[PDB]
Structures are given as C-alpha cells and as structure tokens.
Design a protein around this ligand. Structure first.
Ligand code: MG
Ligand code: MG
Ligand code: MG
Ligand code: MG
Ligand code: MG
Ligand code: MG
Lengths: 47, 250, 105, 110, 97
RNA sequence: AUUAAACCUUGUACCUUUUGCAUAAUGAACUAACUAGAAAACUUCUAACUAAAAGAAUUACAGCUAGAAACCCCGAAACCAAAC
C-alpha cells in the first residue's frame, strides 16, 4: 500500500484500454458523440 | 469633514508621498470619507519579489522541526551473533542478521532524531520584506485604509456582504493597533468567519499578507507600522540587545 | 523496431491530387480552463491565433470548449476516420501554433 | 436592517460631456469661475483633492484607484484618467461577440 | 510490478481552518514589539533544539547536555554509542582531508 | 528486410575485471519487494546594509551578514568483560 493517488490514476486508464479493446462497444454515430453541431459540419463539407 | 492624515515623520524632499482613500466600515455606501498621505519609503519602495520570497520561506522554515526517525543497524533488537561461518555453506558473508541488507534490519541513511531548520534573516532584511509587501498590496488595489474598525452590527453576514459590495477579495486580513482595545462588534463577526482573519498590529507578517487577498489597515496602525519600519533604517548597529535601556528608543 | 513494428506502402486517401485536392483534417477540438497556469499558453492561442487559423482552413470545423480542466487536449479528426489526440499541457502559443499546422497538413 | 445595495458594474465609458462636468465641478469646488490654465492647477492641497476627486466619483461613478491617486498631481492628470474607458468584458466576451467564422464554434462551460 | 485496482479515497484539505489561517502571525513580534521577545522564543519543540540547528553529532551531544540526566538507561546507552560512531566518522573518515 | 512466421544478408552475451584485449577469470535460474555519498575551514553564486556589518561577547586597511552549494554500503581471523 504505497502513497499517492496518481499511480492508481494512470493504471485506471490502463484498465480502460484493456476492457474497451478486448470487448469493444457497438459503433455509435458521430452525432451522439460530443462536439457535434449539424449546421457547422454541413458548411465545412461544401467548403 | 474630510479626514486628512499626513506623515508625522520627515519624508525625503525628492520623494513625493503616496496617497490612499480613507474609508469607513460603518456604512455600506461610506466608501470614501477622507484622504491619507503614506510615507513613500514604506509604501513606494522598489518592487523586489526575491525579498518577499526570502521572508516567505523564512516564515516557513525556522519554526520547522521534523520528528521523523529511523533506527540504525545497532539500535535494532538482536543481530548480535554471526549467523553462520564465512565458508563451507555456499552463502554470502554476513555478520549480523540485522544489517541494512536484511529484512527487519536498520535503515542505512534515514532521518535521525528530531531535526531543526532554524535560521534567522538579518533584522533589516525581514523589515524590508514588510515594506515590500505593503507596497504590493497598495499598488494592486488590495490595501484599504480605514479610520476605525467599528461596525454597525456584530452579524457576520453584514461583513461578508460588505466585502462583495466594495469588490474586496474573498479573504480579508484586518489589522488593529492593539489586541486589547479592538471593538467587540468586530470580534464577534470575524471569529465566526473563516476567511476574514483579524490580527493585531504587532502580529503583522509577510506570509499572512500573501495568503490574504485584501488587507484592511486602521489609521493608527499605519502610523505604528510606518515608525517601526522606518526606524530600521537611519539606526546604528545595536551595542546591546535592544530591549535594554536606550537613550532614544521606546 | 522495424521488425518489431508494422509497416505499409505509400498511399493516399482517395487519390487526393488526381482531381481536386481535399483537405484531410476534418475537426479540431480544444478544451481549456479559465483559471489554470498550464492552459495559459493555450488561452493566448484562442485569443489571437484561432481566428486566423479558422479562416485560413475553412474545411476544418473548430470546437473550443473551455471547461474546468487539468490538461488542455487537442483532438484531431481526419476524413478517413482516424483520430489523433495530443496533450498541450503547459505549451506556449508558439508551440501550439506550430503543432496545429502539422495536424492540418 | 442594513440592506446591501445592488452590486455596481466595474466598467466605465467616458461621457461625451465629461469636459462640461469637470469644468463645472472645478468652479463649484473653489468658486473661481474656472481661471485660465485650469488644467495646470495642482491638487497638492489635501482638502482640494478630496473634494474634487470625490465629487467626480459620485457623479461619474468611477473613483481614482489608490495606486493611481498619487500620480494625480494636476487637474490634467485627473481629466486624462476619467477619459480612458474601463471595460468589464473579459477577453472571452470579445471572442463570443467577434462574429467568428462559421467553422469556429465556442461553448462556455463556466 | 502491481498497482491498485481502485482509486484511493479523495483527500480534502480545508485551507481556511484556524491553524492555517493564522499561520505566521507574531513572527515579527520583536521588531514591531520593541524587541521584547525574539521570534525564536515562539518555536515549539524539543528543549535542546528550540532556536538552534546543528549536524547530527552536534545534535547528539546537545540532546545529552539538556536531558542527559533524565534519560532512560537504554536510550542513554544508545545515544552514547551513536555519538562514538559519529565521532569516528566525521573526524576520521570522508573523502576530504 | 520481405508478398511471406522460418530459408537470404549482417552480427564473437552482460557486468566487474584485468593495459585502453578477451574464445579469459569472477557474479547472476527467474519474478516481486527491500538494498549503498552525510558534515561548510577555504572557495564560487545570490541578496541586505555599508567604514561599517551582526537581535550582547564576532570580524574589518570594503567589509560584513544571510541564503544556496560536501565528503557511501557489505564482509574477517581476532581482543577484553561477565555470565552459562
Ligand atoms: Mg548489537
Ligand atoms: Mg559475538
Ligand atoms: Mg562484523
Ligand atoms: Mg525496523
Ligand atoms: Mg551462478
Ligand atoms: Mg566496513
């Protein structure tokens, strides 16, 4: 039982990769994900 | 009636005194009631942040005493007899089961006993730090000069609300001339409030000002600080400890 | 590391230069903190550089989402679907500007 | 029952008629009908400075910072100080209202 | 190596408690108080190292001087051995002569 | 490197150690945890005041005060005292 919160945090992300990569989730449309505005993306498509 | 304060001591001719807006805590809208003239050599010294660093670290270290301790290989219980003969057994050579290389042994270079970090900066250096800190608050509009600390009501809520109205910082440091004479109304209010910390004039320190956003100084305390710090320059070197009788020292 | 790593052949996305050159960078997202020393350099980037970059590249949708944050992060999305994120912690405006221009190209 | 007045804004825009207010204020303070070279007049007198600066603050709504109080040697310095505007809009507020190109979008989480 | 499988509990520090808020007050008691008390007099610690600093050998000898006669037999024996070890180290060993 | 895991080409384990060479000679089956440079006389650097510096005793023909900056680990055959 060592000191600190950081070493656990880096490992918690290591656990994240193990779970996600071994058992990937079903694909989700980019709309559901953050940083989406329909009109702005449509404008960029033409440009 | 404009409350006007002027320096009791002699300002250098070339320097021009700094000025501040005297305020009263009695009323919410009593923002400005008088004008003050602050000695330039106290409130206008050259800006140097290394001295603030020097004093700030001093206010951290000299008090420090660390009580961490680790036994050495001799203070560890046991480990008197030699575990086994040097040769014939096919193992490395050890002279005590309590050595730095052994589980349960004594630490090699660990903390030993209580340690002290006591040192004092020169008298002028620490006094100079107070002068530097005073200007920094003044220029950054964090220092408010008040005639007296009298407040209309002891309710803590009034003091917190007043600070927001006058745009003071969240943490306020209040300095009064002497501990004994401080008004009772302020005593009740400040005690209930964590951020608003009230200290006497003699207890002024650089670290407190750095931790606290704004600083409220009473008029007599400003005069008290002005004399004390400006005495540090234009003085001789002590023939004695200062507490002993002196011709011209209080 | 050559034998210890994957490899490929030179390739493009959709024959980029055969017809009309289409910009591959699709989106850049930057998260910042109002009051944080580490993101100070990135705050300068948003004040001045971001506006110039947005007009210069009009095919890159730019999202700026200041939030209470510990590390500023830039996420780059390309048209082929590849994602790339680079940490901008305590980087000056000069470093970010040079870094962003690599992503667009 | 002390009721805190509503918080005041810390932004100041110089009025167009600032000159009329200042000249009238100087006349009222000393009653000399604005002697020529009024700007050059110094504020060395403690009472003079307090009456002038305090009166302008009440009307205009902005007061000289303690840090800048000492440099108000003359009326001209006081006049210049009020002329410069004071903005409370953060640098972010300029970006939001800057009308940035459509491809650039900003969302404020605070 | 091995690392924790769960995040440790959050550590919350109250920076406006009475001890932290008033830390440092009266550090200038002397210069602002007509030098009635030296600031060293405000230190709370072992009697033999209030307002004093030294290396371990000096620290060992100073602990003996103040409380040498009020120490337990085993503690005093260990202190004596600790002094003799340090003496031969600092006065007979080291890279520089 | 390669279309291709292997074939083809290139390549005399590591540390310590010997002369600045090893195909030597020491040490290591592997994993986890533990396991060895410490002090301020002189010097350099940074500030405060300055024929003076230092919060009593100290030093001074620009000094004086404060800060930072340093010197390991394991292992005998033995020797003495007192019990058993
Ligand atoms: Mg023993
Ligand atoms: Mg024995
Ligand atoms: Mg031995
Ligand atoms: Mg132990
Ligand atoms: Mg072996
Ligand atoms: Mg040895």
């Amino acid at each position: 039982v060592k000191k600190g919160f950081r070493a656990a945090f880096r490992f918690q992300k290591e656990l994240e990769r193990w779970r996600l990569l071994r058992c990937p989730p079903p694909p989700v449309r980019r709309s559901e994900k953050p940083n989406w505005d329909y009109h702005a993306e449509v404008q960029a498509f033409g440009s | 009636d404009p409350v006007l304060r002027k320096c009791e001591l002699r300002i250098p001719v070339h320097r021009r005194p700094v000025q501040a807006w005297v305020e009263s805590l009695r009323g919410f809208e009593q923002e400005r009631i008088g004008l003050a003239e602050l000695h330039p050599d106290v409130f206008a010294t050259a800006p140097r942040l290394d001295i603030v660093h020097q004093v700030a670290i001093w206010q951290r270290n000299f008090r420090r005493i660390s009580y961490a301790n680790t036994k050495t290989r001799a203070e560890v219980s046991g480990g008197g007899r030699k575990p086994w003969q040097q040769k014939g057994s096919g193992r490395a050579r050890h002279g005590s089961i309590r050595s730095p290389l052994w589980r349960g042994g004594g630490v090699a270079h660990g903390p030993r006993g209580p340690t002290s970090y006591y040192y004092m900066l020169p008298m002028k250096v620490r006094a100079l730090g107070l002068k530097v800190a005073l200007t920094v608050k003044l220029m950054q509009d964090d220092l408010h000069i008040v005639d007296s600390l009298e407040l209309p009501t002891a309710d803590p809520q009034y003091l917190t609300e007043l600070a927001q109205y006058r745009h003071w910082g969240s943490s306020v440091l209040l300095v009064d001339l002497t501990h004994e004479e401080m008004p009772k109304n302020v005593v009740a209010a400040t005690s209930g409030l964590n951020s608003f910390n009230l200290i006497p004039a003699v207890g002024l320190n650089v670290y407190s000002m750095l931790k606290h956003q704004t600083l409220v100084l009473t008029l007599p305390s400003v005069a008290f600080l002005e004399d004390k710090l400006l005495w540090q320059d234009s003085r001789y070197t002590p023939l004695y400890p200062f507490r002993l009788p002196y011709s011209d020292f209080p | 590391t050559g034998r210890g790593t994957s490899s490929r052949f030179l390739t493009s996305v959709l024959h980029n230069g055969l017809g009309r050159y289409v910009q591959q960078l699709q989106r850049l997202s930057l998260s910042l903190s109002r009051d944080a020393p580490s993101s100070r350099g990135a705050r300068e980037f948003v004040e001045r550089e971001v506006t110039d970059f947005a007009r210069r590249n009009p095919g890159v949708v730019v999202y700026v989402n200041p939030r209470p944050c510990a590390m500023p992060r830039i996420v780059a999305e390309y048209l082929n679907g590849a994602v790339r994120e680079e940490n901008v912690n305590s980087k000056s405006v000069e470093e970010i500007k040079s870094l962003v221009q690599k992503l667009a190209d | 029952v002390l009721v805190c007045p509503p918080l005041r804004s810390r932004a100041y825009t110089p009025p167009s008629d600032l000159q009329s207010r200042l000249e009238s204020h100087i006349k009222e303070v000393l009653g000399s009908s604005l002697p020529n070279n009024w700007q050059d007049i110094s504020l060395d007198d403690g009472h003079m400075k307090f009456r002038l600066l305090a009166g302008l603050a009440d009307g205009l709504g902005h007061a000289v910072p303690n840090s800048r109080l000492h440099q108000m040697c003359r009326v001209r310095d006081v006049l210049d100080f009020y002329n410069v505007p004071v903005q409370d809009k953060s640098k972010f507020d300029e970006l939001v209202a800057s009308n940035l190109p459509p491809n650039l979008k900003i969302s404020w989480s605070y | 190596a091995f690392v924790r499988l769960t995040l440790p509990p959050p550590k919350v520090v109250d920076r406006w408690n009475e001890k932290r808020a008033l830390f440092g007050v009266y550090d200038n008691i002397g210069i602002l108080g007509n030098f009635e008390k030296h600031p060293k007099e405000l230190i709370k610690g072992p009697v033999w190292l209030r307002g004093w600093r030294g290396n371990e050998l000096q620290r060992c000898v100073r602990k003996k001087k103040f409380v040498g006669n009020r120490m337990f037999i085993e503690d005093l024996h260990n202190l004596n051995k600790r002094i003799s070890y340090l003496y031969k180290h600092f006065n007979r060993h080291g890279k520089y002569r």
